[PDB]
Amino acid sequence: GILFEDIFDVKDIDPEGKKFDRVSRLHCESESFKMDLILDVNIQIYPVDLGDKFRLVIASTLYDRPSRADQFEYVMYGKVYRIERLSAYVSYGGLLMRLQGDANNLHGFEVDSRVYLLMKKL
């Protein structure tokens, strides 16, 4: 059911300076796919640091009774809202994600569809 997944390396914890006390905007790079993503992460619950390999999975569904995909340890929920090497803008309420690049592996995406994140440190 997975739309998209790979291992990512966060390179700028916050690129233009800390603007918020609970959310910092990461800049990452993939492993051998070279998908740039610009992801906001609530760091009070899930602190992230510079140069930290972390998994990232985009899933349309998670399948406490149906026993969810919970091996990952940070799960958001939001919808894709723009597709502009394709960019693919996902919004998580206010937390933006601009997963980019190489439109052959981005093929699962669409517009106006519900999308989960499932992150995990390594």
Added chain:
Amino acid sequence: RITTPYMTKYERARVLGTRALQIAMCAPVMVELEGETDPLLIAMKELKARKIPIIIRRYLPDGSYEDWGVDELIIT
């Protein structure tokens, strides 16, 4: 046949203006009303059900006229 087929806000006001005052003088009601005692609230129920016994006489300013049934108009 040449004026606007949209009921203007000045025609909706007076049609609700006089159908309220007609129904506040015991006119026959066309909407089998459901407890509304304000006569104005009955008249908007008359408009949305499109049952008002009123024909608007639209005056072109030369003196000629052009009739328009309130059934035959596009309210907002």
Added chain:
Amino acid sequence: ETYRLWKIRKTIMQLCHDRGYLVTQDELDQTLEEFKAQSGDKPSTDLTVLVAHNQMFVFFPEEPKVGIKTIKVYCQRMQEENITRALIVVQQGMTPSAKQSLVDMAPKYILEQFLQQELLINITEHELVPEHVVMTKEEVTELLARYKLRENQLPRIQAGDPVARYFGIKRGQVVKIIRPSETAGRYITYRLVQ
């Protein structure tokens, strides 16, 4: 200097082309070099046009203030040639007794009067003045009918207006004005004349 004794001749042969005469196109546009044939002589009347309709008779009297006698110089050749309309393009202005001599001899011959510096620019090609178009007699009757309007009740332009005096319009005619806009560019308005 001669930017005048030429552009005035350029203007009135734009003017009487707009009023519907037959000015050949080569006679219309002259550069100054085409008028440098006469350019030294006239500063230190040799300029008088007769053109006919598809017939006006302009005048450039070299006197600054045209008196009654100066009109009376060509009152007689006005009635000699059987011409009906004329123009008197003056230098300063008419003497205040002479303007009545136009309206005393009103219905026989027309003879409208212009100033020099009034005519040094073509006010039709001004950016603020939109394209006035004189409408025909049948163009009025399809106007009044569509709007169901009496001849009066139209917006009104004076008879002594600078563009009515340009186009040469008697009382009772209706001009059609194409005012340029930004969304349409064809905002059409009409004007009855006074």
Added chain:
Amino acid sequence: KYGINDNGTTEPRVLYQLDRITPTQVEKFLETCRDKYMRAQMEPGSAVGALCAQSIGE
């Protein structure tokens, strides 16, 4: 730039959502732009100068 519309099928399917304008939308686009234009006319008999005197004066 990419993504030929040969019949509307390329192999990455996502590419047809670049500028989607599908003809259910463009007919609803016209029926809205008509009716938004028709609605926003000057309603006849609307004290047109009395609106003007407030909108210059205020």
Added chain:
DNA sequence: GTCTGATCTCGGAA
């Protein structure tokens, strides 16, 4: 206590 167009008196001229 001015800001106002109108309406009255003077004067130099074709």
